[PDB]
Amino acid sequence: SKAFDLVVIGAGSGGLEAGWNAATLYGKRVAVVDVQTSHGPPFYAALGGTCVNVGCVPKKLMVTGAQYMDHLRESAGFGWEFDGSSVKANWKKLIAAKNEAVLDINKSYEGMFNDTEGLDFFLGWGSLESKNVVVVRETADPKSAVKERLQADHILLATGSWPQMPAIPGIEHCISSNEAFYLPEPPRRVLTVGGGFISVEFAGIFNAYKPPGGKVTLCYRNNLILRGFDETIREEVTKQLTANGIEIMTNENPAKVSLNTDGSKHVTFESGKTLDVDVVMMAIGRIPRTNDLQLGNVGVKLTPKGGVQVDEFSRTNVPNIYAIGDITDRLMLTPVAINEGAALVDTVFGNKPRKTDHTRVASAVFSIPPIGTCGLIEEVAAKEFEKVAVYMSSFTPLMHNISGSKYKKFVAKIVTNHSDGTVLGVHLLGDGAPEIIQAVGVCLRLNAKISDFYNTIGVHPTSAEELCSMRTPSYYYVKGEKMEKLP
Amino acid sequence: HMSKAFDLVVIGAGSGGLEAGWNAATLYGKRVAVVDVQTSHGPPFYAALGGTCVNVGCVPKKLMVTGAQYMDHLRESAGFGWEFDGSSVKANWKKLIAAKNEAVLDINKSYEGMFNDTEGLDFFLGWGSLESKNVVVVRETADPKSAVKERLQADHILLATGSWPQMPAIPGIEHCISSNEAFYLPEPPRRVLTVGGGFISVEFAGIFNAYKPPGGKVTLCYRNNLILRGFDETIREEVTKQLTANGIEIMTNENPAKVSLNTDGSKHVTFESGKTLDVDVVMMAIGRIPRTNDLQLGNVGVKLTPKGGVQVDEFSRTNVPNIYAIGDITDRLMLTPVAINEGAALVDTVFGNKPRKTDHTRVASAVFSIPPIGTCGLIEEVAAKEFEKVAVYMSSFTPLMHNISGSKYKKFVAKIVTNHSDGTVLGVHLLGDGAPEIIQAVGVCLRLNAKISDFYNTIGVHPTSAEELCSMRTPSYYYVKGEKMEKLP
Ligand SMILES: Cc1cc2nc3c(=O)[nH]c(=O)nc-3n(C[C@H](O)[C@H](O)[C@H](O)COP(=O)(O)OP(=O)(O)OC[C@H]3O[C@@H](n4cnc5c(N)ncnc54)[C@H](O)[C@@H]3O)c2cc1C
Ligand SMILES: Cc1cc2nc3c(=O)[nH]c(=O)nc-3n(C[C@H](O)[C@H](O)[C@H](O)COP(=O)(O)OP(=O)(O)OC[C@H]3O[C@@H](n4cnc5c(N)ncnc54)[C@H](O)[C@@H]3O)c2cc1C
Ligand SMILES: c1cc(-c2ccc3c(c2)OCO3)n[nH]1
Ligand SMILES: c1cc(-c2ccc3c(c2)OCO3)n[nH]1
Numbered sequence: 014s015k016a017f018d019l020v021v022i023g024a025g026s027g028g029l030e031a032g033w034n035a036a037t038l039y040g041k042r043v044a045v046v047d048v049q050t051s052h053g054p055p056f057y058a059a060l061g062g063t064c065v066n067v068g069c070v071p072k073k074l075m076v077t078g079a080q081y082m083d084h085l086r087e088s089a090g091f092g093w094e095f096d097g098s099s100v101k102a103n104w105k106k107l108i109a110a111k112n113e114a115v116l117d118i119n120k121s122y123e124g125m126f127n128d129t130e131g132l133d134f135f136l137g138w139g140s141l142e143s144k145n146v147v148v149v150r151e152t153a154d155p156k157s158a159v160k161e162r163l164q165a166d167h168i169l170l171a172t173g174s175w176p177q178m179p180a181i182p183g184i185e186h187c188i189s190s191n192e193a194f195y196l197p198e199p200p201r202r203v204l205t206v207g208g209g210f211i212s213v214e215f216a217g218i219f220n221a222y223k224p225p226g227g228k229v230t231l232c233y234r235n236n237l238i239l240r241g242f243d244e245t246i247r248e249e250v251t252k253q254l255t256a257n258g259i260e261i262m263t264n265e266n267p268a269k270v271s272l273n274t275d276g277s278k279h280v281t282f283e284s285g286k287t288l289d290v291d292v293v294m295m296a297i298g299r300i301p302r303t304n305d306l307q308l309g310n311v312g313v314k315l316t317p318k319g320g321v322q323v324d325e326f327s328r329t330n331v332p333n334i335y336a337i338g339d340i341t342d343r344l345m346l347t348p349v350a351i352n353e354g355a356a357l358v359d360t361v362f363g364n365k366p367r368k369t370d371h372t373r374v375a376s377a378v379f380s381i382p383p384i385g386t387c388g389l390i391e392e393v394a395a396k397e398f399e400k401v402a403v404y405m406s407s408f409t410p411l412m413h414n415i416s417g418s419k420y421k422k423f424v425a426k427i428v429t430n431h432s433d434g435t436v437l438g439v440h441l442l443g444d445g446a447p448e449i450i451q452a453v454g455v456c457l458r459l460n461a462k463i464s465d466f467y468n469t470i471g472v473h474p475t476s477a478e479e480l481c482s483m484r485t486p487s488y489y490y491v492k493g494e495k496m497e498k499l500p
Numbered sequence: 501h502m503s504k505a506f507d508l509v510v511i512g513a514g515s516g517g518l519e520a521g522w523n524a525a526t527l528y529g530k531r532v533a534v535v536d537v538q539t540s541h542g543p544p545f546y547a548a549l550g551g552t553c554v555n556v557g558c559v560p561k562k563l564m565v566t567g568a569q570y571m572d573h574l575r576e577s578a579g580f581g582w583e584f585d586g587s588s589v590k591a592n593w594k595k596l597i598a599a600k601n602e603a604v605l606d607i608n609k610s611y612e613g614m615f616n617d618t619e620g621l622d623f624f625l626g627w628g629s630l631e632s633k634n635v636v637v638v639r640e641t642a643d644p645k646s647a648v649k650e651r652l653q654a655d656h657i658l659l660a661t662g663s664w665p666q667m668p669a670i671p672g673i674e675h676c677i678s679s680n681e682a683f684y685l686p687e688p689p690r691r692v693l694t695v696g697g698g699f700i701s702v703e704f705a706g707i708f709n710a711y712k713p714p715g716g717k718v719t720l721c722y723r724n725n726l727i728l729r730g731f732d733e734t735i736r737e738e739v740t741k742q743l744t745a746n747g748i749e750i751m752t753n754e755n756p757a758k759v760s761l762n763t764d765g766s767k768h769v770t771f772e773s774g775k776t777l778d779v780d781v782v783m784m785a786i787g788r789i790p791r792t793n794d795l796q797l798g799n800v801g802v803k804l805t806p807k808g809g810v811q812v813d814e815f816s817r818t819n820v821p822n823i824y825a826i827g828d829i830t831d832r833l834m835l836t837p838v839a840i841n842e843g844a845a846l847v848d849t850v851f852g853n854k855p856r857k858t859d860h861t862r863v864a865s866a867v868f869s870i871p872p873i874g875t876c877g878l879i880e881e882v883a884a885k886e887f888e889k890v891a892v893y894m895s896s897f898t899p900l901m902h903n904i905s906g907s908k909y910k911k912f913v914a915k916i917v918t919n920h921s922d923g924t925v926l927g928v929h930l931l932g933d934g935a936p937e938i939i940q941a942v943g944v945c946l947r948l949n950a951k952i953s954d955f956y957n958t959i960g961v962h963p964t965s966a967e968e969l970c971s972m973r974t975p976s977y978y979y980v981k982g983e984k985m986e987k988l989p
């Protein structure tokens with residue numbers, strides 16, 4: 014049995030920020046628990062967290078690899094010549110390069126623990142035995158062998174989330190993004206189920222690495238993918254994914270999946286339609302990872318949706334027990350979880366309470382082409398403000414008239430409170446949009462107005478300078494209703 | 501034939517002149533005349549309707565840099581599993597140049613249709629010069645004895661003729677070219693020397709390096725010790741390494757003394773040091789000078805600066821009350837969006853009853869080197885002269901994707917320079933893929949007087965290069981009364 018100021022369950026994005034800051038900035042004694050020291054089967058997430066192991070980091074590398082399908086074709090317009098029929102996409106090489114990069118990060122986190130005073134790592138499954146006791150066991154079974162009993166002044170829950178799987182016959186023949194990262198071969202035919210960023214991103218990945226004759230289908234149960242993003246951009250990215258060979262099935266939802274004699278999957282949709290694919294990847298959502306923590310032992314309250322309930326300072330209903338990151342079922346982003354962890358430790362172990370601002374968080378979708386966005390979409394703005402202006406620019410950049418990818422329209426939209434010009438939201442689609450949007454996030458913390466953008470001198474030639482060239486609204490929302498001109 | 505009368509006559513239908521002209525006619529209902537020497541791009545006069553950027557500047561060079569980036573893309577794709585017959589790869593420069601020409605000509609034609617269509621915005625073809633305070637003459641050539649095509653009466657006159665490449669007076673200067681001719685080379689040079697340490701020399705070095713035929717070599721020479729004066733010094737050093745790593749030879753402290761022709765027609769360059777280099781093309785890129793010689797400014801008494809640019813006040817006014825100058829002819833910041841801003845501000849002031857002067861500080865700009873630069877505001881050595889305590893926040897690392905691509909030399913550099921007394925960001929300097937796109941909204945931040953804490957409090961977009969700007973809380977080092985030091989005393 015061992016004594017700590019802070020025990021962190023989950024060595025992930027938010028958990029490592031909290032642990033490292035508590036130890037090195039405040040001299041505290043810190044224990045951090047995770048179920049695996051490096052990435053992959055059987056538990057997928059590991060030391061480093063979901064983003065590091067089966068998340069942002071590997072998916073970004075694989076999206077980068079998938080973009081070369083466009084680069085190779087588009088180079089022809091600029092005079093590059095080579096034997097197109099000799100081109101092949103080696104998925105095994107991608108996966109191996111990805112595995113080595115992830116493993117390197119796993120190893121560096123190991124050395125971080127070895128090098129840091131007051132920061133100890135424990136392997137296994139952590140759960141709440143008592144208000145000030147964290148137990149570590151061999152497996153997720155609450156009856157497997159105890160390895161450690163850690164007593165804690167403070168406990169931080171940071172176990173992240175997990176893929177949601179629908180309760181349909183044959184769900185066991187489907188995979189999630191976890192398994193997608195380790196497929197031995199690129200699927201020739203794949204259905205990705207869901208309208209959100211994980212489904213969209215992997216559709217683009219599989220589309221580039223599919224073998225000859227392959228086909229990627231994405232299905233989504235409602236009318237338009239990427240709910241919560243700008244509507245113009247949701248429609249455009251639909252169009253540009255279709256232009257690159259991806260079939261988008263909207264208003265369709267799998268009802269059952271069955272095994273074919275050749276190992277492929279027979280999908281039946283609620284509509285009666287059927288589709289045979291090699292892989293069915295469910296990406297319909299991610300849910301807080303709360304079940305193995307034994308929160309009933311101490312009475313941590315959950316919300317109706319299953320997150321650990323927290324106040325703005327990440328405090329549960331139980332004194333000295335905190336929750337940050339995806340387990341709180343708010344914004345499931347790595348930088349938000351990091352911010353939450355650091356604010357928590359500043360509050361608890363320093364003389365300054367800090368709370369994370371969950372508004373105006375910049376984020377991205379690494380679709381091909383990608384999205385960058387910060388702040389409110391226009392229909393959410395229209396419910397909060399009497400007068401909303403939308404400034405819009407949408408064109409194919411000159412380079413893609415030459416590249417041949419004429420479908421690749423760049424979209425830039427600025428949403429303002431039209432009563433005082435305050436920028437409420439900025440939404441981008443096109444090459445570079447994730448990079449363009451970062452300092453827009455800083456602008457929104459200086460209460461930038463549309464005139465601050467338009468009076469800034471552009472950098473030319475760029476996509477980004479579009480943001481500084483919009484003077485006149487394209488249309489408005491007044492009292493929640495969309496109209497081209499003001500009343 | 502009668503002379504025509506206008507509220508405003510603009511000499512030079514370029515970045516600044518067109519902005520001024522369009523705004524005066526369409527926003528304020530004025531009658532505008534615009535003069536340029538050529539209706540579409542290329543020889544003999546290179547620049548034309550649309551200006552230097554459109555015809556032989558930012559627009560074509562960006563397309564050509566984009567083409568040159570595919571040499572990196574094709575090679576780096578193998579790290580991500582792409583396989584193809586490397587021996588089959590060819591860079592067809594004629595295709596690149598033909599694609600560039602058609603894009604530029606399309607812009608030319610669209611500008612031509614704007615004039616045919618727009619009330620009070622007229623285009624005149626020829627060489628404009630100042631005859632008197634209120635008369636612009638349009639002649640058939642730059643020679644003031646050439647024939648008069650039009651006389652344009654003008655209440656207000658805008659000088660916006662831009663700039664021109666400077667050629668050094670060395671023996672054999674006639675065997676060399678400028679960026680103008682580089683845009684039309686029938687074939688990519690096997691061996692090329694680009695002379696100059698500035699952005700045009702560096703950008704063209706990258707372009708030629710990607711399209712050079714088999715066994716080719718690109719050499720860049722610079723007469724001082726380190727290229728890209730005016731930019732962040734860490735970035736100057738890093739861009740040198742990464743150009744070198746991609747096969748460009750950088751000769752610093754070297755300067756052509758003379759050029760002669762070998763018996764085979766190639767160029768034999770002798771440097772002041774006595775070193776020699778044989779190349780097929782010598783491209784001079786040592787500077788650009790404001791284009792005033794042909795305006796006959798003596799006729800009305802418009803004052804030039806010692807340097808040679810039209811002298812202006814903050815409102816772009818010359819010493820003659822109704823004659824204004826904007827853009828490269830004022831020999832300050834030679835950037836297309838600055839000229840445009842100046843044009844728009846001038847027209848708002850003169851015709852709009854809304855006075856406004858261009859802010860020449862904290863202008864974001866880019867270098868489309870491979871990899872590219874994005875910058876806004878002060879470099880640290882300049883800031884350390886003006887501020888008692890300067891802090892420098894610095895991140896420099898090879899991004900993970902280039903550990904897989906094999907281009908491990910591609911260190912991304914992000915630097916933030918502050919007034920440490922109050923945290924105000926004085927400058928941001930970036931090197932690496934996406935830097936020109938990242939820096940644009942940084943320009944808005946500095947115009948809003950952002951502090952380092954505004955950057956640090958902003959939550960990162962992950963994984964990006966840009967997020968490094970929002971994760972820097974502790975200075976890497978300082979300047980205290982001009983002195984560099986890791987710590988404050
Ligand atoms: C495919 C995919 C792509 C993504 N891409 C992005 C992106 O581009 N950008 C972005 O910002 N976000 C992205 N995310 C989201 C991001 O990964 C999460 O928001 C972030 O990792 C959550 O951090 P956290 O601190 O909540 O926990 P995590 O980082 O998930 O860490 C939780 C850790 O807890 C461990 N654990 C779980 N239960 C226990 C237990 N009982 N005992 C001990 N240890 C336990 C797990 O092994 C895991 O390592 C992506 C997610 C996915 C799935
Ligand atoms: C190779 C190169 C690359 C560049 N890249 C960039 C870049 O990426 N970004 C950037 O911001 N800037 C770039 N620039 C600079 C940019 O092109 C200039 O800053 C900008 O064009 C200047 O605008 P202006 O209105 O002063 O004149 P210009 O746009 O140069 O227009 C002047 C016009 O006047 C005409 N003219 C000249 N004399 C006469 C006369 N007597 N009568 C009538 N017409 C006349 C010319 O034909 C020309 O069209 C680049 C320049 C070069 C040379
Ligand atoms: C899978 C993808 C490809 C591919 C991708 C891009 C190309 C190309 C082929 O030939 C010219 O540009 N081949 N097999
Ligand atoms: C000039 C440059 C090249 C080139 C560039 C990139 C390559 C490549 C060849 O083979 C694989 O990747 N060929 N001629």
Ligand SMILES: [Br-]
Nearest residue numbers: 207208233234
């Ligand atoms: Br769905």
Ligand SMILES: [Br-]
Nearest residue numbers: 235236237240
């Ligand atoms: Br919907």
Ligand SMILES: [Br-]
Nearest residue numbers: 591592593594
């Ligand atoms: Br060629």
Ligand SMILES: [Br-]
Nearest residue numbers: 952953956973
């Ligand atoms: Br700070």
